Design a protein around this ligand. Sequence first.
Ligand code: GH8
Ligand code: GH8
Lengths: 190, 190
Amino acid sequence: RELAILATAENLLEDRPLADISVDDLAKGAGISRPTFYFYFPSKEAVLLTLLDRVVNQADMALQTLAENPADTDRENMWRTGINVFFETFGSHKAVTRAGQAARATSVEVAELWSTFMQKWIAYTAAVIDAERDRGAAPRTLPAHELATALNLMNERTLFASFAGEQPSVPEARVLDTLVHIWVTSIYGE
Amino acid sequence: RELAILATAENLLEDRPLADISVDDLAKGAGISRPTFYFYFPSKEAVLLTLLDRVVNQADMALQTLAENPADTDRENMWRTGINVFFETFGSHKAVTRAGQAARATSVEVAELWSTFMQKWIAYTAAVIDAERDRGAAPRTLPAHELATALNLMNERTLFASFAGEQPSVPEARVLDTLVHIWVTSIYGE
Ligand SMILES: CC(C)N1CCC2(CC1)CC(=O)c1cc(-c3ccc(C(=O)NCc4ccccc4)cc3)ccc1O2
Ligand SMILES: CC(C)N1CCC2(CC1)CC(=O)c1cc(-c3ccc(C(=O)NCc4ccccc4)cc3)ccc1O2
């Protein structure tokens, strides 16, 4: 029933925003009463928070698997494989991504959830850039953590604008090549 | 009196969000009645739209002046000078920038205003990258317009996160050097 509320909410977010979705709409869809819904979730906001949490953790766990299982290819394809975890994971959950992003303005818990994982992904990127510099593969240019921060923020804004079909945006079919180019040139360039 | 409403609103946005500012608060501050306020502006939303419009046009006009008056320095400093128009202009109007950005979620007019200028600044960046490639200064890598789009979206997200003191963010004293590095390496790198 928890899963049916989550699936119903993800389905309804494809067609319209959270503002335009009611607890009644969510309960109706999961085959339960308004009061039974409130046993599982304090609000329609708490339902989005859970969905965004699953997407963010799915992305995180897939990046952990990648880190532990290095791909055997040139650095450019190694980087593409990694940026692709975020392209595929968030790109398979566009509605939750769109509404998760809006909800950062209004929800302290969503803002904190996003803040914690971005800190984690930036720190991993900084550690990878430092390891590439120690092994002599990348030159010592910007502070690694400041470079990693800007490249992660770029990816957040650029992936999400592509997913939303925003004007302006990189066409979704071109966004992965675009971000890999900028990571590789900015990390390895003198 | 229009100017006094605008100045009052900019002042009040330093201390709290638009949601927490009333028409009465804006009228009080400009030394006028609620009804006299509504002669000048249909809403507190229309007041933000005007303020964001002044900032965006101040940025645009400063970039036009730069384009017409090339700085006489190496390419790296030419690019820094340009990114600095956005750093200084939006950085001198942090509260309007912060609330202008939030208001994109809720205001079609703010979303369209932002969309028009980003299209204009991306097109200028694409034309500059193409001119650098025609003169043999930059290699033909990514489509210029897709590169320009990603670099402009990076700058929007990275400048605004710095201004807001977001976690995570590039410290404001480091953000200009960070974006110039990534523009120069991604535009001139092979
Ligand atoms: C060549 C060798 C030295 N590398 C190859 C790559 C790897 C191991 C060592 C393995 C990997 O996969 C990898 C991945 C990231 C990464 C990618 C993208 C984001 C990213 O886009 N985050 C912003 C974001 C968040 C949420 C929504 C949208 C955007 C973050 C980190 C960094 C470093 C890596 O090292
Ligand atoms: C070396 C020679 C070939 N160039 C030198 C630079 C120049 C002439 C030719 C002159 C210039 O000043 C210049 C500036 C931009 C520019 C910079 C930043 C943004 C930018 O950050 N926009 C996103 C944004 C919007 C609003 C808030 C925050 C961020 C856009 C365009 C591009 C191209 C230029 O050509």
